[PDB]
C-alpha cells in the first residue's frame, strides 16, 4: 500500500514565564519514530520506534542539530507574527508546521506538503504544484512575498521530492517487520436496547494497523451513510487502533442490517450481522 | 530525516 513520512512541529510562546516551548514529532504512516521537546532534560532528538535505533551517532547528531535550528527559526517567527498582527506581548500564541511526503505502493513519489498555521488557523501553505503559495489572509501576504523572493518553494521542492522520499524508503525497508505489517481488525457487534421499539447496533473493529479503515452499515443492501454514528478512530495504546460504527434500528428488525469492514489486513471485506 | 534549510516567516 501507500506510505508517508511526516514531521509535525508545535511552537508556543510563554511570555514572562520562560522561553518558548518547542515540540517536534516524526511519523512513518501511523507510527511515530522520533521526538524532540525543548523542555526535556535530554536536548536530543529521541527514538520512538524500534527500527530507527539502527541509525548511528552521526544521524542522531545531525537530526538534533537540525531540530534545534527549527526551534530557533520558530522562536523568531513567534515575534514576527505578533508584530504582523499588532498583538500584545503578554498573550500566548501558537505556531504549527507540518511537512512531508507520500509515496505509492511502488514507493514512487505521489505528493509533497508544507503547511503552516498561527493560533490554530491556516496561515500559509505550499500548493500541490510545489511552486506556489496559498496565503490565508493579509499578514500571510507579507510572508508569501518574502517566500517568493527567497524561492522557499524551490528549497522545499528539492527536499520533498528527494531527501524526504529517499529516507522514507530507507525507513520502510529498515523497519519492514512492523512498518510494512498489517494487523487485521478483530470485529464483533453489540446490541443495546435503547427505549421501546428500538435498539442500537454497534459494530467494532479493534487492534488494527494501519489506522485507515472503512466501517459501513447497510439496510437491506443500501448504504446508510447519513444514519450512521461513527466515532473518531482512536489509539489502543499498544500501537493499534480502534473504531466503531453504530446505527439506531427498530426492535425486531436488527437482522436487516449489515456492518461492513474494509481494511488492508483483511483478504476480503467482512460482513457482520446480529445473531 | 528533517529538512535542513528553513526560512523565517
Amino acid at each position, epitope marked *: 500500500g501507500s506510505h508517508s513520512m511526516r514531521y509535525f512541529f508545535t511552537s508556543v510562546s510563554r511570555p514572562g514565564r520562560g522561553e518558548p516551548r518547542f515540540i517536534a514529532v516524526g511519523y512513518v504512516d501511523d507510527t511515530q519514530f522520533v521526538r524532540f521537546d525543548s523542555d526535556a532534560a535530554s536536548q536530543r532528538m529521541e527514538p520512538r520506534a524500534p527500527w530507527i535505533e539502527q541509525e548511528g551517532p552521526e544521524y542522531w547528531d545531525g537530526e538534533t*542539530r537540525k531540530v*534545534k535550528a527549527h526551534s*530557533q*527559526t520558530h*522562536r*523568531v517567527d513567534l515575534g514576527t507574527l505578533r508584530g504582523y498582527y499588532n498583538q500584545s506581548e503578554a498573550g500566548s500564541h501558537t505556531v504549527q508546521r507540518m511537512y512531508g511526503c507520500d509515496v505509492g505502493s511502488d514507493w514512487r513519489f505521489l505528493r509533497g506538503y508544507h503547511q503552516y498555521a498561527y493560533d490554530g488557523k491556516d496561515y500559509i501553505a505550499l500548493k500541490e504544484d510545489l511552486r506556489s503559495w496559498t496565503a490565508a489572509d493579509m499578514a500571510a501576504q507579507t510572508t508569501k512575498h518574502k517566500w517568493e523572493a*527567497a524561492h522557499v518553494a524551490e528549497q522545499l521542492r528539492a527536499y520533498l521530492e528527494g531527501t524526504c522520499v529517499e529516507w522514507l524508503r530507507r525507513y520502510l525497508e529498515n523497519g519492514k517487520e512492523t512498518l510494512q505489517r498489517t494487523d487485521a481488525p478483530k470485529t464483533h457487534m453489540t446490541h443495546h436496547a435503547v427505549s421501546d421499539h428500538e435498539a442500537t447496533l454497534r459494530c467494532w473493529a479493534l487492534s488494527f494497523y494501519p489506522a485507515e479503515i472503512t466501517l459501513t452499515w447497510q439496510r437491506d443492501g443500501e448504504d446508510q451513510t447519513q444514519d450512521t454514528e461513527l466515532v473518531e478512530t482512536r489509539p489502543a495504546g499498544d500501537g493499534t487502533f480502534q473504531k466503531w460504527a453504530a446505527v439506531v434500528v427498530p426492535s425486531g428488525q436488527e437482522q436487516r442490517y449489515t456492518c461492513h469492514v474494509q481494511h488492508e489486513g483483511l483478504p476480503k471485506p467482512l460482513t457482520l450481522r446480529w445473531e | 530525516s528533517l529538512l*535542513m*534549510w528553513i526560512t*523565517q516567516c
Partner: T-cell receptor, first 115, second 114 residues
Framework: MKQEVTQIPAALSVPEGENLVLNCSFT??????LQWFRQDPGKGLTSLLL?????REQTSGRLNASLDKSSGRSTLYIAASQPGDSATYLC?????????????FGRGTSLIVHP | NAGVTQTPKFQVLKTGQSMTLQCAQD?????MSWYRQDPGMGLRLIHY???????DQGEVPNGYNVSRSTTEDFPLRLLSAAPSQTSVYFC????????????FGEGSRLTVLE
C-alpha cells in the same frame, strides 16, 4: 563526499584594463549556495556575490559569477580590472545535509592588477 | 542594519589572562560562528551555534568556550590565553535558510605574549 573546495590558479597577475576570470571547483555538488569574498592583507573579508542553488548567476557592477552546480564549479569574472581589484579572492560553499551549516572555504586566489 | 559587530578590534594579552570577544548581530540570524585566521593562513572554525542553548565544536575548539543564551550574541571566551592563540578572529553569521548568505564581522587582532 567530504567537501573540498579548490581555486586554481592560486595566483594571478594582469595589466589594468583587462577582463579576467577566477576559478572555483568543489567535490560535492550537493550545496545550498556558493559565495565569493574578497580580502586584503591585514583586513577583513568583504562579500562580493552570493549564488543560491536555484540561481545560475549574479552580477554586481564590474563583477559577475556563474554557478555550474552539476559540474562542481563556479567562475568569477572581473571586467576592466583596476589596481584596486588587487586582493585574495575566496570562494566558499554551504552543505545540504548534516545540520551543521558549516561552510567549506577554498584556499583562495591572489590577484595583482598592475597599473 | 548594523550588520555583525565584533569587539574589541585590537587586544594584547599576557599568557594566562582571560578574554571575551563579543559578537552581536541584529538580523535574527540563527547561525553564528567564530573563526581564527593566522597571517597568511586559512580560516579555521572554532565553534558555532544554530540556536539559543546550542553550541557545537568546529575544527579547533581547544582553549575556547562559547555560549548562546540570546539570539543576538555569540561571545568567544578565552579562559587562559596562550601565545599560540595570537591570531585574527572573525565572527560570521547567517540565516539557516533564505539565501544562507554569510556575514563577517570586521575582525579582532589578538596578540598573546609571555
Amino acid at each position: 563526499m567530504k567537501q573540498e573546495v579548490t581555486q586554481i590558479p592560486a595566483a594571478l597577475s594582469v595589466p589594468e584594463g583587462e577582463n579576467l576570470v577566477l576559478n572555483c571547483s568543489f567535490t560535492d555538488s550537493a550545496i545550498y549556495n556558493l559565495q565569493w569574498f574578497r580580502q586584503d592583507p591585514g583586513k577583513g573579508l568583504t562579500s562580493l556575490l552570493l549564488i543560491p542553488f536555484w540561481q545560475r548567476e549574479q552580477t554586481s557592477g564590474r563583477l559577475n559569477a556563474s554557478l555550474d552546480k552539476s559540474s562542481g564549479r563556479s567562475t568569477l569574472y572581473i571586467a576592466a580590472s583596476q589596481p584596486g581589484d588587487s586582493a585574495t579572492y575566496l570562494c566558499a560553499v554551504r552543505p545540504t545535509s548534516g545540520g551543521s551549516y558549516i561552510p567549506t572555504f577554498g584556499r583562495g586566489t591572489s590577484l595583482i592588477v598592475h597599473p | 542594519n548594523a550588520g555583525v559587530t565584533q569587539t574589541p578590534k585590537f587586544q594584547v594579552l599576557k599568557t594566562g589572562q582571560s578574554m571575551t570577544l563579543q559578537c552581536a548581530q541584529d538580523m535574527n540570524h540563527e547561525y553564528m560562528s567564530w573563526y581564527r585566521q593566522d597571517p597568511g593562513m586559512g580560516l579555521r572554525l572554532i565553534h558555532y551555534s544554530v540556536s539559543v542553548g546550542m553550541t557545537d565544536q568546529g575544527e579547533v575548539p581547544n582553549g575556547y568556550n562559547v555560549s548562546r543564551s540570546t539570539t543576538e550574541d555569540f561571545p568567544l571566551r578565552l579562559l587562559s590565553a596562550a601565545p599560540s592563540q595570537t591570531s585574527v578572529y572573525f565572527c560570521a553569521s547567517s540565516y539557516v535558510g533564505n539565501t544562507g548568505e554569510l556575514f563577517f564581522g570586521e575582525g579582532s587582532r589578538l596578540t598573546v605574549l609571555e
